[PDB]
């Protein structure tokens, strides 16, 4: 399922509620087209991979999450598991989300 993180509070809780399944985060800006342009994919995987958890973050309204993750280029895909980080990669590459997810699945 998908989950929107509007505050660092929902961030950690998202990982804790994610259980043990993979967790890919999409640090995209709702006001920036190029980032939101990849939503028909990242958010789409929600129905193709109901076994994976997908999160969302607003680098502008949630600078608290981007601040701790020190994001400087959107979209930034960050992978977490059990509250721990395992990998990450930015740059518009929706096809990689598949290879990366099937990697640490």
């Amino acid at each position: 399922m998908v989950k929107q993180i509007e505050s660092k509070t929902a961030f950690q809780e998202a990982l804790d509620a994610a259980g043990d399944k993979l967790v890919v985060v999409d640090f995209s800006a709702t006001w920036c087209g190029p980032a939101k342009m990849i939503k028909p994919f990242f958010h789409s995987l929600s129905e193709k991979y109901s076994n994976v958890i997908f999160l969302e973050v607003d680098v502008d309204d949630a600078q608290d999450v981007a601040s701790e993750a020190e994001v400087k280029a959107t979209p930034t895909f960050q992978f977490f598991k059990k509250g721990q980080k395992v990998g990450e990669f930015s740059g518009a590459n929706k096809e990689k989300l598949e290879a990366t997810i099937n990697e640490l699945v």
Partner: peptide, 13 residues
């Protein structure tokens, strides 16, 4: 307003 850094989505390639 809500602006931060550059969006290197399908902007770079």
């Amino acid at each position: 307003f809500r602006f931060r850094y550059v969006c290197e989505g399908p902007s770079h390639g």
